[PDB]
Design a protein around this ligand. Structure first.
Ligand SMILES: [Zn+2]
Ligand SMILES: [Zn+2]
Lengths: 7, 767, 716
């Protein structure tokens, strides 16, 4: 699972 | 910061490359099409023949509707299998023909459970019990292995072929070997550009390489020749004429073939006569001053010719411009600005007259396939000229503004390649499934009159048909989902044959399993074809919306159901879908789903067609070009350099790169490009010394010009079309075109923008 | 002698009138029962005449325009001549200055009534020969045809343009000269085409082509193509007939010339080996089961093609005639070819109609080369696109013409309201004509009367020419000269002129009322010119000037020319075709066959066409026009089966048998449509052919009964 900080 | 395409392609090559992938487990997930591994059948069909969007189907319709992950299969029935991989076995079941379930009609495969001592086998697709015919009976042993298994391919292997008995043949009689009909446009344009002579001269060479089975000594395929320009010129080349005869039909409108016997002969037997004619044609029309030509009549004739010889065939049409001469299929110059919210934009991508669709049906009806080599130089209305060849299962080759000193090799390469292609004829593919789901939609160079039979007048090793499935009932997490692709066809030796592809997928009530088994490339191939077919039916804005929202939906579902709790400032993507967004954005940026500013309708219609036929290998590369750095190349001891992201950010004023999507191949040169390289490649001393307009093959060079030519060769290797090389000098040169293939940049929105967008609607689905 | 008069006027002016002295009043002429008419041959052989090389000199009155002739009064010392037709005073042309009573221009000499001029038109056009060939026949036939065609091609002038079209299931227009590849344009034999469409499709301009080229330039190529020509490839299923597109092939041939060489001499020569089975022009179905229409079938209205098929060719025939082109039909097959439907083509343009069993017969081969007979100077005895105009004195008018021609519908003072045959004109077009071509011109009355015939045509030499014939016969007061009139009667001419009117009607909407009208006239003529006391048959006797007329009628009314039911519609059309073309001489033989007897007791002598003439010790030679039959009497038939002919003793007997054979040999060369030959004898399978040749006025009776019933009706 890849997570990305959209901020 | 997302896991990039390159990183994903490389990681998989590391963990799975150079390893045997044995298709023995059920819902087994295969390596990426980008990964080079060895495949050994062992039960289920090779990933080279068929890949899926997921290898674990959702158990119910609601579950499927939750995830919204399209359930589909990409099938390349005659994919070229590597020389180092085991070949297909030809199974013969005698007089009776191949054993099949009386109910669902599935062929005898590794999925039939033999019971009661081996006298009755229960079908694995519909659970119906059958009686093992006399001649086929065999004893079971410990748990059923039936002491046959490993000995008979249809019981132990996933792919293999069956001999087809007469009741599989048209008119219940053995079919005839196919014929190749070469039809040359001899109007002015092609006489001047030296194409006519090129084709005739070169044709003398290639007619030799016409395919023929090993079991025979000479090809069973005969040939025929025709030329035209608003009028048709048939030629008699019987093996008993020192001189060829010419019969001109002018009654376009109610066309007909003025021959039988003399038209369609064994090239070997009539060799000198054919050559004779081939030497002549060029001179014959040299002074022709005709510019208008017909088109439908040509297809109409070749088909009619085949119907008469009562055999299947393939037409090799060489055309140059928009057919304006009065006759059925006459094409106007209808390029209009109805394309953004026109809601009427679809009309641009559909043939003008209603004749082309009919002609296509007639062709398929008689097993006539048409392949078109087009050399336009101005609008040509590809949506029209490509219909019959698309529906007929043929291929479309377009060479814009053809110029001999540059494109000669590209065309002659495509032509040779096409004539030598392994091909089936007068085929029909049927995709049977196990209880619970079924094939409900098809995409490919195909034609369908009912809703189960995919008709391909011709099919080759490159064609792929994409099949979508839908829930019929409920599947068992115990039996999973089965698939059997069967293709009935006629060989170049005139034999009725059946090719079978069995694949067992897993099934589950758990969403985790559904996602863990997805394949981005497979999904991307479906979405592309699905969208491209829709172009001829809905406003592009509607299509794009559906795509984006389905993408956000799939991800939102995973977020609210599988993903462990995480902050709202984060966007969660399953490993299986890491690079799905990137590719989705590429599809959305593609000219087919975009608009007017530049890029001709003819270019859009063409690309839209090319994709419809693509396999997973092809679509992956088409939507995400391969960018290779060449200046940093390791000299003689190479093996193709590591790829670099499709963005300008990875370009250097000091560098030289290679970008390829399968059709185009760009050689990019930066301004501060090392003169050492520019010399060892273009034989000239400096950057400013190169002329783009001279995009021909540069030899010489000992260490580099050779190492670059080596990679350009390895890239073209598995690719069906021979790519058009285009040299690009950095600063303000043609580069504008080049920039389009840097799919990660904005050029629609950039990769990051699209990611930013998806998250918004994923959040909108408030959860 | 009136006989010498008839003979000399035919030899000089190729003219033969029913009456050589005319009634000075429409009434007495009306009840003179046989109209003032004439059998006229425009290009009668006349070697004793020079072609005179200059323009004709015409009357200055627009409506007249007669050609200066012997009947014109000339005032040399004023260089003027008065037109004998409209009296208009005319000036001579400067070149005539020297003209004088003792040194006058040829056209003024009586010996030159009837002379030929040589126009200085300009366009010296080459003859055009277009071969339209059927390929649906056995290899024997097609090979022979190919040989006959090569033969003719060798006789053509080097400048003549030749064209080849072949057909079967489809129609092929061959492009000649095209070396190294040999090409042709193919069309569906199932659909028609206009001259324009063809001009467009063949990719031709408007008004030598790739299709029609010089004989001296194509020779090699064409003679090769002809020899390599093979029969229609498409196989024919059992019980079926080949698919022959005769109707369309001809249409394409007409169109081809219509859009390339309109209004110039040309022969469209179509050879067919069977009936058209795939129209337009379609003559009969393709299933052998159904037989080709018969005269009975066509009458029981059980012939579904005749009307459609005929309408097609008719259209073609009128186009071709209007374009000035001739259409010839050579039909050789074991069964009917469809001549009935196609007759108008060679009938309307002066084309030839040739029947036969197979092109592989001496019958055909011979006939075909006679088509290309040359004159003493090596030029075809062929004339093209002739225009015929006929001027008459004001007391006379033209009713019409019957024969190979087409009306140009040129009105004028000479035309009569009451028209006959092809009437309502003083001009006709005869696209194809020979030294034999003869027409029947019928006149009407309203000191001598005069008639002039002016025939302009293209001689086979390319030379444009005008043939002029001016005749004058004496006017007579019927209330004071009936004798002088009746003595001028020409029974042979009258016979034929009348037969020509009867046969013309037999085609028209008119049925068997022909025999009726024909007989009514015979009776009327007997009543007006026969010697007799009322109600006393036995007293009836005809002057030697009329005596043979009754017999001519007897043979006419019973001839295949009016009794078609014993021949096929094709044959019927064939016989009529030839009869309506013939000169007096040949016409008579057609109507009343000649019978000569040979015997040891005297030289060959013509004998009655009666059974009484058939004797055991006599050999008979019957010359119908279409066949030559030799019949051995019972006694002679035996001596021959016994063999006396070989023994050196019977030198004479061997001669007797040969005498008739020798004469049959001459005719079998001299005659154009070569006649069928027949050698039979007493009790021979073919005696039939001789025996058969040997209210209404009567029925299938004898000449005697016929004459009796005639004699009694003439006297009451
Ligand atoms: Zn089943
Ligand atoms: Zn006058």
């Amino acid at each position: 699972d890849v997570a990305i900080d959209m901020m | 910061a997302m896991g990039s395409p390159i990183q994903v392609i490389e990681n998989d090559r590391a963990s799975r490359g150079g390893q045997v992938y044995a298709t023995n487990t059920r819902g087994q997930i295969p390596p990426l099409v980008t990964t080079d591994c060895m495949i050994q059948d062992q039960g289920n069909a090779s990933p080279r023949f068929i890949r899926c969007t997921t290898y674990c189907f959702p158990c119910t319709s609601d579950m499927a509707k939750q995830a919204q992950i399209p359930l589909a299969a990409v099938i390349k029935p005659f994919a070229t299998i590597p020389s180092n991989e085991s070949p297909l076995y030809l199974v013969n079941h005698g007089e009776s023909g191949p054993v099949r379930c009386n109910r669902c009609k599935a062929y005898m495969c590794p999925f039939m459970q033999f019971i009661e001592g081996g006298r009755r086998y229960q079908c694995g697709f519909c659970n119906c019990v059958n009686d093992v015919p006399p001649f086929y009976f065999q004893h079971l042993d410990h748990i059923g292995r039936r002491l046959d298994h490993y000995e008979k391919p249809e019981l132990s292997l996933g792919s293999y072929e069956y001999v087809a008995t007469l009741d599989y043949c048209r008119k219940s009689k053995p079919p005839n070997p196919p014929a190749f009909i070469f039809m040359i446009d001899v109007s002015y344009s092609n006489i001047k550009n030296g194409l006519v002579k090129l084709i005739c001269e070169e044709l003398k060479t290639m007619l030799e390489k016409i395919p023929k089975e090993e079991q025979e000594e000479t090809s069973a395929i005969r040939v025929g020749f025709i030329t035209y320009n608003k009028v048709l010129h048939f030629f008699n080349v019987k093996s008993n004429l020192a001189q060829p005869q010419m019969m001109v039909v002018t009654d376009v409108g109610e066309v007909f073939v003025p021959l039988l016997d003399g038209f369609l002969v064994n090239y070997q037997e009539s060799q000198s006569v054919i050559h004779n004619l081939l030497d002549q044609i060029p001179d014959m029309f040299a002074d022709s001053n005709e510019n208008e030509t017909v088109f439908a009549p040509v297809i109409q004739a070749g088909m009619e010719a085949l119907k008469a010889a009562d055999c299947p065939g393939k037409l090799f049409i060489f055309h140059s411009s928009l057919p304006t001469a009065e006759a059925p299929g006459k094409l106007k110059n209808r390029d209009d600005k109805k394309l953004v919210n026109t809601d009427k934009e679809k009309i641009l991508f559909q043939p003008q007259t209603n004749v082309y669709d009919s002609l296509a049906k007639d062709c398929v009806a008689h097993g006539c396939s048409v392949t078109l080599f087009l050399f336009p130089s101005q609008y040509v209305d590809v949506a029209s000229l490509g219909l019959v060849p698309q529906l007929t299962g043929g291929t479309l080759y377009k060479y814009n503004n053809f110029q001999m000193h540059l494109d000669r090799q590209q065309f002659l390469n495509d032509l040779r390649n096409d004539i030598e292609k392994k091909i089936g004829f007068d085929a029909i593919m049927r995709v049977r499934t196990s209880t619970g789901f079924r094939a409900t939609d098809f995409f490919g160079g195909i034609l369908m009159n009912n809703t189960t039979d995919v008709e391909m007048a011709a099919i080759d090793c490159d064609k792929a048909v994409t099949v979508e499935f839908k829930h019929d009932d409920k599947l068992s997490e115990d039996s999973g989902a089965l698939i059997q692709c069967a293709v009935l066809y006629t060989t170049i030796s005139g034999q009725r044959r059946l090719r079978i592809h069995n694949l067992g997928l897993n099934c589950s009530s758990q969403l985790a399993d559904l996602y863990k088994s997805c394949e981005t490339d497979a999904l991307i191939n479906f979405f592309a074809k699905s969208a491209f077919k829709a172009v001829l039916h809905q406003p592009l804005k509607v299509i794009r919306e559906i795509l984006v929202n389905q993408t956000a939906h799939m991800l939102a579902c995973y977020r609210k159901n599988c993903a462990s709790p995480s902050a709202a400032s984060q966007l969660i993507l399953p490993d299986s879908m890491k690079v799905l967004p990137v590719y989705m954005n590429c599809l959305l940026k593609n000219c087919v789903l975009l608009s007017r500013p530049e890029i001709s309708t003819d270019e859009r219609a063409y690309q839209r067609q090319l994709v419809m036929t693509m396999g997973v290998a092809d679509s992956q590369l088409f939507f995400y070009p391969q960018l290779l750095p060449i200046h940093t190349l390791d000299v003689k001891s190479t093996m193709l350099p590591a790829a670099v992201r499709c963005s300008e950010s990875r370009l250097s004023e000091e560098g030289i790169f290679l970008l390829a999507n399968g059709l185009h191949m760009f050689l990019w040169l930066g301004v501060s490009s090392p003169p050492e390289l520019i010399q060892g490649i273009f034989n000239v001393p400096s950057f400013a010394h190169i002329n783009t307009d001279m995009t021909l093959l540069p030899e010489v060079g000992n260490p580099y010009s050779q190492q670059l030519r080596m990679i350009m060769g390895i890239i073209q290797q598995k690719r069906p079309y021979s790519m058009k090389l285009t040299i690009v000098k950095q600063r303000e040169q043609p580069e504008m075109v080049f920039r389009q293939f840097l799919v990660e940049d904005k050029g629609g929105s950039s990769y990051v923008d699209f990611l930013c967008c998806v998250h918004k609607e994923i959040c909108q689905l408030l959860n | 002698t009136y006989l010498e008069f008839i003979q000399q006027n035919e030899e000089r002016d190729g003219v033969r009138f029913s009456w050589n002295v005319w009634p000075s009043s429409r009434l007495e002429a009306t009840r003179m029962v046989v109209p003032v008419a004439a059998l006229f041959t425009p290009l009668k052989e006349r070697p004793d005449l020079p072609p005179i090389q200059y323009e004709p000199v015409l009357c200055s009155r627009t409506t007249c325009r007669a050609v200066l002739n012997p009947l014109c009064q000339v005032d040399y010392r004023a260089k003027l001549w008065a037109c004998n037709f409209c009296y208009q005073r005319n000036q001579f042309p400067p070149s005539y200055a020297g003209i004088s009573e003792l040194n006058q221009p040829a056209e003024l000499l009586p010996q030159f009534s009837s002379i030929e001029y040589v126009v200085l038109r300009g366009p010296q056009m080459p003859l055009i020969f277009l071969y339209v060939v059927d390929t649906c026949m056995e290899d024997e036939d097609l090979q022979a045809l190919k040989e006959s065609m090569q033969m003719s091609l060798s006789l053509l002038p080097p400048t003549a343009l030749v064209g080849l079209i072949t057909f079967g299931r489809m129609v092929q227009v061959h492009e000649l000269g095209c070396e190294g590849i040999s090409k042709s344009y193919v069309f569906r034999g199932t659909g028609d085409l206009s001259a324009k469409q063809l001009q467009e499709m063949l990719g031709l301009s408007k008004v030598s082509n790739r299709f029609l080229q010089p004989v001296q330039k194509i020779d090699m190529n064409l003679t090769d193509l002809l020899g390599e020509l093979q029969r229609d490839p498409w196989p024919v299923p059992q019980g079926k007939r080949p698919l022959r597109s005769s109707g369309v092939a001809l249409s394409i041939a007409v169109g081809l010339l219509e859009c390339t060489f309109p209004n110039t001499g040309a022969r469209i020569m179509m050879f067919i080996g069977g009936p058209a089975t795939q129209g337009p022009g379609m003559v009969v179905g393709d299933e052998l089961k159904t037989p080709i229409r018969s005269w009975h079938d066509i009458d029981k209205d059980n012939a579904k093609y005749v009307k459609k098929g005929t309408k097609h060719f008719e259209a073609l025939a009128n186009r071709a005639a209007t374009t000035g082109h001739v259409i010839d039909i050579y039909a050789c097959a074991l069964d009917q070819t469809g001549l009935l439907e196609m007759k108008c083509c060679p009938n309307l343009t002066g084309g030839y109609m040739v029947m036969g069993d197979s092109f592989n017969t001496s019958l055909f081969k011979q006939t075909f080369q006679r088509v290309f007979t040359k004159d003493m100077h090596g030029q075809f005895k062929m004339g093209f696109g002739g225009t015929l105009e006929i001027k008459t004195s004001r007391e006379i008018k033209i009713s019409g013409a019957i024969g190979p021609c087409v009306s140009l519908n040129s009105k004028g003072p000479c035309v009569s309201e009451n028209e006959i045959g092809t009437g309502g004109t003083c001009q006709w077009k005869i696209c194809g004509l020979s030294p034999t071509t003869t027409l029947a011109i019928y006149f009407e009355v309203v000191g001598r009367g005069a008639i002039q015939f002016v025939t302009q045509y293209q001689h086979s030499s390319g030379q444009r020419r005008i043939r002029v014939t001016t005749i004058a016969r004496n006017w007579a007061d019927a209330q004071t000269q009936i004798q002088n009139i009746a003595a001028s009667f020409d029974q042979e001419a009258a016979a034929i002129l009348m037969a020509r009117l009867a046969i013309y009607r037999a085609e028209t909407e008119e049925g068997p009322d022909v025999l009726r009208w024909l007989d009514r006239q015979l009776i009327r003529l007997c009543q007006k010119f026969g010697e007799y006391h009322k109600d006393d048959p036995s007293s009836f006797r005809f002057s030697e000037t009329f005596s043979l007329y009754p017999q001519f009628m007897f043979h006419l009314r019973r001839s295949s020319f009016l009794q078609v039911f014993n021949n096929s519609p094709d044959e019927s059309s064939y016989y009529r075709h030839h009869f309506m073309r013939q000169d007096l001489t040949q016409s008579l033989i057609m109507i009343q066959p000649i019978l000569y007897a040979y015997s040891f007791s005297g030289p060959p002598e013509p004998v009655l066409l009666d059974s009484s003439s058939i004797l055991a010790d006599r050999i008979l030679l019957m010359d119908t026009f279409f066949q030559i039959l030799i019949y051995h009497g019972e006694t002679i038939a035996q001596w021959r089966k016994s063999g006396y002919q070989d023994m050196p003793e019977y030198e004479n007997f061997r001669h007797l048998l040969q005498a008739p054979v020798d004469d049959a040999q001459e005719i079998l060369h001299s005659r154009f449509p070569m006649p069928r030959y027949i050698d039979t004898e007493h009790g021979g399978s073919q005696a039939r052919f001789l025996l058969s040749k040997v209210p209404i006025l009567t029925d299938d009776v004898s000449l005697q009964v016929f004459m009796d019933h005639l004699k009694k009706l003439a006297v009451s």
